[PDB]
């Protein structure tokens, strides 16, 4: 399972099981470019979030119900959707994944 492997490799579930996570299959520069696109509000209310003009290839990783450390289990869902990231810093780059419309 792609999710069970990438979450492990990326050290996301080596010392615990993370409920959800999304992996973007686009170039890093292309994703970093989102910090200058459509500005929108973040889930929390703050407004340093941005939505992509286009849809991007992504894989959603969702833990199953029976999952428990040390045996985390994930449901893999591939899709193409707009991403919403919160930016910060200089250069202005993404630091959090807010959602995917």
């Amino acid at each position: 399972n792609y999710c069970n492997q990438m979450m492990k490799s990326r050290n996301l579930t080596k010392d615990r099981c993370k409920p959800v996570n999304t992996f973007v299959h686009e170039s890093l520069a292309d994703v970093q470019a989102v910090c200058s696109q459509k500005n929108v509000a973040c889930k929390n209310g703050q407004t340093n979030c941005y939505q992509s003009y286009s849809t991007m290839s992504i894989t959603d990783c969702r833990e199953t119900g029976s999952s428990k450390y040390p045996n985390c289990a994930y449901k893999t869902t591939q899709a193409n959707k707009h991403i919403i990231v919160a930016c910060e810093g200089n250069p202005y780059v993404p630091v959090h994944f807010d959602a995917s419309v």
Binding site: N21, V93, F97
Partner: peptide
């Protein structure tokens, strides 16, 4: 050690 931007990259990027 690992910055907020580096964390994002390790956790979400997979070109």
């Amino acid at each position: 050690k690992e910055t907020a931007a580096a964390k994002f990259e390790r956790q979400h990027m997979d070109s």
